[PDB]
Design a protein around this ligand. Structure first.
Ligand code: 1FL
Ligand code: 1FL
Lengths: 115, 109, 109, 115
């Protein structure tokens, strides 16, 4: 599994469950094409987005729909969403985990990149 | 000054200086229109982006060119940039930068 | 002012006001001795902890009473406090607070 | 496994491997007693610190030896270590993951607490 997303909730100390995630890939003509989407599980994880074959070199945008998450919990947050934009697989294939930690007026994002 | 940006470097424990910042406002047709831009100062701060008059309610995007910042230091970064997207309904957008990670917070006072 | 502390609230997007901060210096016998203390201001800042004269090289501990802060808001927090331990060899110790998480950074200029 | 520690490296985008972790428990007389210790694996994780039976109610300090980690990589970091101090199991037993994200002049810590 070459692209995984993990989301945690810094207010509740829990995984962030059922968070919508949209992934896009920058096309030849510089527009963002829909690549893959899904939502985080009970463990705050989203797997199965893509395959090794499909996940070619490119610039990818991972959009985490944080606003809808916080709104469902009764919190009016600051951000519309958390976007993570990165070049992937430009010196051959890697496995990426995009991790986000969410608070209503703040988020943090890191990537763990392995061979 | 209703909107300011502050950027810090988590590797060096310093302001992140001369970092390009571009701000956009969402247009009626769902396009991002150029609003304001600047480079962070010696103190890692960017002031004077806009005025209370022009900073009306709307959806805004603040894009921080983190890649160029790391590249000028000879450090390979993960992200293409750091984007902060919010509805304006004083705003300080702060970002703390590492090569493979960033945090962003809004202080609204 | 060689040492200042700044605390922000990540739930409200605001300075964290009236937060108790205690600073200690490590003694020769490996004990923590009381050095300086204060409460954060309306801007979430604590200045005037010490002087250049007294702020000599050594190991320092900055303890931020985050538990009391959340408790006064009716929010059950995870941590007892936030501790920052460093060797002093201007220092701004910043902390960004959530109920189950905090981040701390040092800006040294 | 009721107490786990996970450590990531924000400079390299990798788990933080072989990081020393010391856990203490506040004793009756207000001193910190050695509870458990170990070091993070190739995945940046430390498991097997304690058992359900031993991990009673109390105030625990988890000390992550970040300075030694950064020094081994040629970086002179700001902090001596990252300390996480918390009351555990005070409304019955829980499972705790203490997560840290490390940069030379900054760290972040969150806890994920489950039943
Ligand atoms: O599985 C993980 O890698 C994980 C990670 C975090 C976390 C903590 C701090 C941070 F800045 C980002 C994170 F994704 C919090 C909890 C967690 O379980
Ligand atoms: O001026 C400020 O508001 C400031 C802020 C930080 C900081 C710390 C942690 C974090 F997640 C984000 C930040 F921008 C670090 C240092 C700092 O001076």
């Amino acid at each position: 599994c070459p692209l995984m997303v993990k989301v945690l909730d810094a207010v509740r100390g829990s995984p962030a469950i059922n968070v919508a995630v949209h992934v896009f890939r920058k096309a030849a003509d510089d527009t963002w094409e829909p690549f893959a989407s899904g939502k985080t599980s009970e463990s705050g994880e989203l797997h199965g987005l893509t395959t090794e074959e499909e996940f070619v070199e490119g610039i990818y945008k991972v959009e985490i729909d944080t606003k809808s998450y916080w709104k469902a919990l009764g919190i009016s947050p600051f951000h519309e969403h958390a976007e993570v934009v990165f070049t992937a697989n430009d010196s051959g294939p890697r496995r990426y985990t995009i991790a986000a930690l969410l608070s209503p007026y703040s988020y943090s994002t890191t990537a763990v990149v392995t061979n």
